[PDB]
Each structure stands twice: as C-alpha cells, then as structure tokens.
Design a protein around this ligand. Structure first.
Ligand SMILES: *[C@@H]1O[C@H](CO)[C@@H](O[C@@H]2O[C@H](CO)[C@@H](O)[C@H](O)[C@H]2NC(C)=O)[C@H](O)[C@H]1NC(C)=O
Ligand SMILES: *[C@@H]1O[C@H](CO)[C@@H](O)[C@H](O)[C@H]1NC(C)=O
Ligand SMILES: *[C@@H]1O[C@H](CO)[C@@H](O)[C@H](O)[C@H]1NC(C)=O
Ligand SMILES: *[C@@H]1O[C@H](CO)[C@@H](O)[C@H](O)[C@H]1NC(C)=O
Lengths: 229, 106, 219, 228, 231
C-alpha cells in the first residue's frame, strides 16, 4: 500500500552516468503485472518500467518503477511525482521528490594519507586512506583507481559522510584501500577519484606512491683526516 | 683587503688569502685562505662535448690551478662543437652554441 | 586597462602570495605586510641614481595605494592579487576573530594604514632622508586616487610618456617610433569613458608633472 | 544554398556543461515557411527552438534552434537532422549530427612535465607543460587549475590534437602554461585537467608542484687533504 | 585543383644556402599548360618554374615552381607573385608572398625536458620533449639526435609555432621524441637542435640523458688536495 520514492543519489547519477528514478512499494499484496509510473511537472509519460521484482515469500510485493531522464531537468529543480495505479491499491498515492535546494556548495578537500610505517612492518596489508573533508552537501562518491583502471569495490570501503566538528554545514568522509605491502613497496598509482557537486569539474584525484614525499636524503660523507698539518 | 690569489674559471676557485686583524691587539693577526669553489653538479665530463658522461668526481688539487680537465664554462670563452644537420638528406656541418648567452657576435 | 609594472614592483612575501593561509593576523599578516620592507628597492637599486630623488618616493606612493587596493578590490585579475586568496587570507582571519572587523571596514589600510610606509626600505638601502612634505604620501591620505583606474594611468605619463617626449626633444623614424603609445591611448580612453569629461583634463589639472607631456602624439 | 550542421564537440559540451545543438545555413537567403526540427530515427522532433538568426548579407545565417539532450543519448548516434523546407528548394535538406562508432576509444595518458631546471636557473619565468598522449578521438579539452580555481584560457595555449606517427590510432596534444619564477618557487600546485571522451571518468588530473621533481638522494663526499 | 605558394623556410635558407619558392598545384588533370613566372615587386620576374615533377603515385598533375633569389633581397622586403595559367583553373591567380616587415629578433631559448617519472614507470615507452620558447620570427627548425646520429624524421614530431601568452611578439614551439624506456634506462644521450635566425651562429643544441633530466640521485665525489697551496 504505502509507497517509497527514491531520489537519485550523487553516486547513482555518477556511477552509471545516468539518472535512475526508482519507485518501490512495500506492504503490497502480490499480484501479476503491477503498474507503477512517475510524473513530471508537465506530466509527460514515462519510459515503460521494467525489472520489476518478483513476488517475495513474505506476501509483500515490491513494484519498482525506473525511468531514465536527462540530468538537466532534475538539476534545474523540476520536481517528479510517483503515482501507483493498481486494483489492489485502494486509491492512487502521490509522492513528490525533487533535488534538495538551499544548501551552500563547498569544494571537497581530498587529502590522501599513505599507510603508517607501523602497518608496513606487519607485512600483511597496507591501508591507503583517502580523506575527503570539508564538503557540503553530504553526498560524495569516492572511487579508487590503479594505473588508470578502477579497482574493485571489494578492496576499498567508503565510510558514509558525517558532519565535521569545526563547521556545521561541512562534512567529511573516508575511503580505505587495503593493499598488500608488496603491492605498495613497488611504486603504484592508487589514485583516489572523488566526485562531488561543488568541484569545478565534479571530480578530483590524488595519487600516492612510495616515492610521494620521501624528503631528500643527504649523505654527506666527508673524510677530513687526510690533513696532517 | 682580499687578495684574490686564483680565479681559475674551469675549476672554479676563488682562493683569497685575506688578512684579518685579530681583535684590538695586533701581533696575533690570523691569515685565512678562502677557497670558494662552485662545483657545477650538472656539467658533462668533456664539457665541450655534450654527449660525454656526467661529472661524478671533481678533483680540485689547488697546486695545479695556483700555477686541462675543464669543468665550468667561462663567461667570456665560447665552448662549442660541430653538429650534423639533415634537411633533405644533406648532412651539413655547422657550429653550435652551447652557451648562447655569452656568444653573441662581439 | 593597461597594467603598469605593478605586477613585479609589488614584492609581497611568499606566505601571502602563496597558497598557504596565515595563522594569525596580529602576528603574520602583521609581520608579512611589513615583511614587504623589500618594497624599498626603488631607491635601493633602481631609482638610486636613474631619476631624481623625489620620483623614487613618488613610485612608493603608487605602490602604497596599490597595496591598499590589493587588500580590497583592485583590478589585476590574478589568483595571487585579485580574484585571489590573499584578499581571502584577510577575510578568513578576521572572520575567524568573530567578525571583529571587515577587511574593508577596518584594517583596510586605514586602521593601520601607516605600516612603515615603506620608508624603512627606502632608508634601508637608499639611506636618503625623507622630507617632511614627502613623508605624508607614503603614509595615509584621504584621497584614494580612484580605484587604480586613473592612478596607474596617472603613472603612465609620469614616466612612460614624458621620458619618450624628452628623448624626442633630444633617427626620425625612431622618433616616429614613439606613436604606438598614441594608438594605445585609444583603448584606455574608451576605458575611462565608462566627473571630468575625458582623461586629458585629468592629466592637465589633477596631475602635476603631466602638463609637461604632450597631450597627443599624432605622429 | 547548403546547410552546414555544427555538432558541438566534446570541448564545447564540457565547457558549456550542456549539449547545445546548432546547424547553420550557408549561402542561402531567408525565405518564408522556414522549418527547423531536430529529427532522430524515432521521429520525436518535439524540441523547443529559440533565438532564430536573421538574414546575413552574405546569405549565411544560422536559423539556430537549440535543444538539450543527454550526452549518452547522442553518443548512441541519434543522428539529429534539422529539416529545412525552403521555397527555392522544395526538397527538404537533411544534416545528420552523430558520433561515428568506428572511431576507437583510447584513454589519454596525460603527463605533466615540470619546468626545465634551465628555466628556473635563469630566473625569469617557468613554463609548465602538460603532455596528453594516447587518445584516439581528436576531441581533447585541457584546463589548467591553480590552487583549485580554473585559470583563464589566455594564460595557456593548448596545441591542437595532431597525429602521432608512432601510434597510428592515437593522437597527442600539449598545453604549455607559463608563470613567473617568483610564482612557481612560491610552491603553488598547478593541476592539468584533461577532459576526454574515452576516459573512464571523462576527466583526469595531474599535479605539478615546486617539489614534484627533486633529487631524492644527495650523495656528496668531501675529501680534503694537505699534500698532493 | 589547389595551388599554394610556400614562403621560404629558413631550413632551406641556411642549410642549403639558397632560397627556393614552391608554388605547387595538385589534384588537377594533366594538361601541361602551366606557365609559372615568379614576378617580383618590380616588373622583372626573377625566375620561372623549373624541374616539374608530375610523377606521383596518384598520377595527378603536379607542377612545382622555383625562384633562386638573394637572401639579402629577401630581407629587403621584396614580394614575389606566382601565376598559374592552367586551363583547369577558371582564371589565372597570383600568389604574392612577402617577407614580414618589422619582425623583432629574439633568441630561441631551447629547453629539453625528460620523460615524466610516472611515464618511465609505465615501462612501455618514454617521450622526450624539446621545448623552444620565446623566439621571433615565428619560423623555426628543429631536429633530433642520439650520440651524434640524427634520428628519422618520423620518430620526432614537432608542433607549429603558436603565440607566447605573456609576450605577444614571441612564439613557442614543441617537439617530442619517443623511445623505449630501455633506451632511456641505458642512459643514451638525446640532443635537440634549433636552427633560427636570432641565435649567434643560427644553431644551438642541448642534450639530456638518464643522469641529468631531473635525476633522483646526485653522486658526487668532491675531493680537494693541498688545501694550503701558498703562492
Ligand atoms: C673532448 O675533449 C677534448 C680535449 O680534452 C676536445 O677535443 C678537441 O677539441 C678541440 C677544441 O676546439 C677541437 O678542435 C677538436 O676537434 C676536438 N677533438 C676532436 C677529435 O674533434 C674536446 O673538448 C672534446 N672533444 C669533442 C669531439 O668534443
Ligand atoms: C651513504 O654514504 C655512505 C658513505 O659515503 C655509503 O656507504 C652508502 O652506500 C650511502 N648510501 C646511499 C647512497 O644510499
Ligand atoms: C654514494 O657515495 C659514496 C662515496 O662518495 C659511494 O661509495 C657510493 O657508491 C654512492 N652511492 C650511490 C648510490 O651513488
Ligand atoms: C658514484 O661515485 C663513486 C665515487 O666516485 C663511484 O665509485 C661509483 O661508481 C659512482 N656510482 C654511480 C652509479 O655513478
């Protein structure tokens, strides 16, 4: 009966390069061919929704309705409303969702910290934590790339955004790429791709190698005793 | 008060045997020989030949320069070597300018 | 807009001009703006004998007002001087002090306009005594000389035209090679066209050394 | 009498942030019953059109009707055509705009070479150079950002994408940026944003700093004697 | 049917010690009706087309003009016009080419950059770029060498001059050579030459190897002997 409206998150729009508007339903009796649809400000017809979930064993059906839209309409503030039409439903239900507005844009600061020297001595793994701090709103898509190729999401785990103590609006995040020390002693890129609305081009990178840092190591080795007077 | 003993420009050295009066009382005046050397750190082995190896060793026996394995280009002197050039298959020799700043026609 | 050599004659310290922010305005922007005692190389190195003593100090007057407008809205369009963060270095630190005073409210080269007035740098190398009448321009005066649009213009004829004039009064093709400043007068005339009617009268009556200069070359 | 379609290149799409489609009429004067409509294979030419250009003495006007469509939909090759019906030429003219699928997609390998130490030693100005190599489509767009803020296109000059003889299917392009030595020694970090179609994220960055290329190990050994 | 007059490249001026003008027409039918005369600013025409080379794989007509003129005459600013009377062209056209007036002379500072550390880490190829900065006039000529052996023209590719953003009068040019990282790791010296008017003897060269292009390590064995050395 009750319906859930899912606005596309920054990860969804960015990861798939397309805007997915899914409308799932919960607490709905199972029945074949459940019809769901979105509606825009002009009420134009949506793309025929597909990939509808099957009838769950718990006698609750989830009718997911996805429509592909151009990013310009959603980023212009135009609002969408999901409508549910079914015999089981007592009457249609309308839920309107739009891009939240009024939040001040702030550029993330992507600082990338190399693994602690202590962790290397354990010889088991190395954590290359990418620190995305000082960004608003609380919607960032942190991704890791090695040698220009994206790394599997299994290796890196990204903490959800959380408020930053110093300022109210600001937030921060993390992303830790566990890699064996052998993969890190040999110089490897390990770029931290950070995608966020406030950035000039919606992306930022920070490369880390064993070479990055490494202050100049002077080795003055002077023999002076050759002088005898 | 500096007496510039040597100003050799290949093995850059500026030995100045300047006398320094000691405190207010003379008769213990100290004499000092300030061997100011500017090792190039980047000049090639055969400095006139750019394709020669890099100088990883700089001998500065002060006896010889007081009275050659040149290291640093002199300001006045021009160091240059012939170069092959090909335009349409013709290999024409021509003089180069390894130190163009000080090699203007004068 | 024709930027004079304010691009280089401004010798800000590395900290303000660089990406690094400043820790405390009371001690670092404090000590860094004065840190531009290196704004004393006019008579120290260049104007030591190139020109008369007065002009060297006159060039400092230009830098001071330039310095003042860097702190608040100049017209350089550069990430280190305008549209830059150094102006934000000020706003950031004062705002950190509970908005105690806007950079354009106080500390606008008004509350502490005096600084050293660069005279220490003048005295550091040139070692020339400043006349009492000459000592009031390197420090604050009420006239701002109008947002650099007509002061940097003020400086153009003070040297960049009058010395070519006296060269002409001192081959004729080289003499006639001093008319390209006449075409460059047109675009800046359009700029000022955006009080007095045009720029000519400003040189005639606002300015002192300007009337010596010929109003128009015209070959 | 022909209409020249203008497919906004990847550089224009990235700079303007939106796909603004325009087809320009050449060597033709304005006539009654002028028609413009972006027609795809499906035929849903329902786009809005605005700011129609007026006749040009040289018979070259745009009659531009701008529209907003997804990047990916255009990448699918919808082949938009602005149908024009003119009195002198009864037959409508078609001008397709689309991405040829034949062209490969090789990601640029953007490299940022710091200024030569021979520039810094002379101590006048340092010219940072960004080297973009290995991209098959000739639609690179390079931006320079200093301190996280974009720089005006005046400060840098991006060489047009030229063929790479050593790689038949890849082109290269460079974009030098010159700054005062007093600004490069300040420690500012210049980031060479390179925007390209083939990139997995459509954008790549490389950072050059005062200390990007430094001798990691100084090995001096002073040997001071008293005799020969 | 396109004909373009090529201004005299300084490479031909200096290395061949002669001035040659080539107003060549291509993509046209072979009728052998070309009458090319390089008329000067004055009424006299210095020279006509010579050594016509029609032979080409495409079998299309190709007539090349020639004009042996004094280098000092070129520097004087005299203009030369090439006229083509081939029936393919609807009407004869004259292509006037003149030496630019008032061009300033500025030295072509040549800076040779090594491949980026990251590029060498790729272990596939290494690109060496020879940068030519702050030169006027815009014409410039660049070639590459390795231990005294000039490389093939295809291996090194150069860029057309473009304006220098800070100095409108000056220009800049960009030349890039690629080699296997093993060749670079071997330490083989690569030398870049720039032939341009402003240089003292019109040619300057700079070289780079593994040990001098932003090297990681400075291996110094500084030794001083006979410190006193009185004299
Ligand atoms: C290698 O060093 C030697 C001296 O130690 C030089 O060789 C000759 O230098 C003179 C100086 O003008 C030239 O005229 C000769 O042509 C050089 N020799 C040869 C065989 O060409 C020079 O500094 C270096 N050699 C070269 C070839 O550059
Ligand atoms: C440091 O210097 C010592 C003595 O000069 C030498 O034995 C050692 O190998 C050097 N270490 C380096 C260059 O890493
Ligand atoms: C460092 O210098 C010492 C003595 O100068 C030398 O023995 C050693 O091989 C050098 N090490 C390197 C890595 O160059
Ligand atoms: C470094 O210098 C030392 C002393 O001159 C020498 O023995 C050694 O072979 C050099 N090593 C390299 C790699 O240049």
């Amino acid at each position: 009966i009750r319906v859930f409206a899912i606005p596309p998150s920054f990860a969804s729009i960015f990861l798939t390069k397309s805007t997915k508007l899914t409308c799932l339903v919960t607490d709905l009796t199972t029945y074949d061919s459940v019809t769901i649809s979105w509606t825009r400000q002009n009420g134009e017809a949506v793309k025929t929704h597909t990939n509808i979930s099957e009838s769950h064993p718990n006698a609750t059906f989830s009718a997911v309705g996805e429509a592909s839209i151009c990013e310009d309409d959603w980023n212009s503030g135009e609002r969408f409303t999901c409508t549910v039409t079914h015999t089981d439903l007592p009457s249609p239900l309308k839920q309107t969702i739009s891009r939240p507005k009024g939040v001040a844009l702030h550029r993330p600061d992507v600082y990338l910290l190399p693994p602690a020297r202590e962790q290397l001595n354990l010889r088991e793994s190395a954590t290359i934590t990418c620190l995305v701090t000082g960004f608003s709103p609380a919607d960032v898509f942190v991704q890791w790339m090695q040698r220009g190729q994206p790394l599997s999401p299994e290796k890196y785990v990204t903490s959800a955004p959380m408020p930053e103590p110093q300022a109210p609006g600001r937030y921060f995040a993390h992303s830790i790429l566990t890699v064996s020390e052998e993969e890190w002693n040999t110089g490897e890129t390990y770029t931290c791709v950070v995608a966020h609305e406030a950035l000039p081009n919606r992306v930022t990178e920070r490369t880390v190698d064993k070479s990055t840092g490494k202050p100049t190591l002077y080795n003055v080795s002077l023999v002076m005793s050759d002088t005898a007077g | 008060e500096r007496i510039v003993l040597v100003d050799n420009k290949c093995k850059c050295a500026r030995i100045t045997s300047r006398i320094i009066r000691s405190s207010e009382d003379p008769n213990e005046d100290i004499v000092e020989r300030n061997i100011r050397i500017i090792v190039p750190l980047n000049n090639r082995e055969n400095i006139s030949d750019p394709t020669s190896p890099l100088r990883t060793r700089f001998v500065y026996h002060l006896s010889d320069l007081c009275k050659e394995t040149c290291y640093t280009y002199d300001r006045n002197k021009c160091y240059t070597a012939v170069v092959p050039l090909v335009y349409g298959g013709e290999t024409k020799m021509v003089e180069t300018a390894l130190t163009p700043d000080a090699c203007y026609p004068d | 807009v024709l930027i004079p050599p304010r691009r280089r004659q401004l010798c800000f310290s590395r900290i303000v001009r660089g990406p690094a922010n400043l820790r405390s305005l009371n001690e670092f922007k404090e000590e860094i703006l004065k840190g531009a005692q290196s704004e004393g190389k006019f008579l120290g190195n260049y104007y030591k004998e190139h020109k008369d003593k007065e002009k060297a100090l006159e060039a400092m007057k230009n830098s001071f007002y330039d310095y003042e407008d860097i702190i608040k809205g100049t017209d350089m369009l550069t990430n280190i001087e305008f549209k830059d963060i150094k102006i934000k270095l000020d706003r950031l630190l004062e705002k950190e002090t509970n908005n105690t005073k806007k950079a354009e409210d106080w500390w606008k080269t008004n509350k502490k306009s005096i600084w050293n007035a660069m005279l220490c740098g003048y005295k550091k190398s040139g070692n020339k005594i400043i006349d009492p009448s000459w000592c009031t321009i390197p420090t604050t005066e009420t006239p701002p000389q109008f947002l650099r649009w007509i002061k940097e213009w003020g400086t153009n004829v003070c040297i960049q035209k009058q010395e070519h004039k006296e060269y002409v009064k001192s081959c004729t093709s080289e003499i006639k090679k001093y008319q390209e400043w006449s075409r460059k007068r047109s675009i800046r005339w359009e700029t000022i066209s955006k009080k007095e009617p045009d720029a000519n009268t400003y040189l005639r009556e606002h300015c002192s050394k300007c009337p010596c200069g010929f109003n128009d070359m015209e070959e």
